[PDB]
């Protein structure tokens, strides 16, 4: 993800590139 309210990591490991950017990484 990048823009939304549900974090992409919610049921996933930190495979996302956003994993150090808490300003980012969501979906809806």
Q: How far is the C-alpha of 28 from the C-alpha of 20, rounded, in Å?
A: 20
Per DSSP (E only), the strands in the chain are 6-7, 26-27
- Alpha carbon dihedral 5, 8, 12, 17, in 10-degree steps, equals -150
Structure-block tokens of residue 16: 């996302």
Range 4-24 burial, b when 16+ CB lie within 10 A, else e: eeebbeeeeeeebebeeeeee
């Amino acid at each position: 993800g990048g823009d939304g309210s549900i974090a992409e990591y919610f049921n996933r490991p930190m495979h996302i590139h956003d994993w150090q950017i808490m300003d980012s990484g969501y979906y809806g």
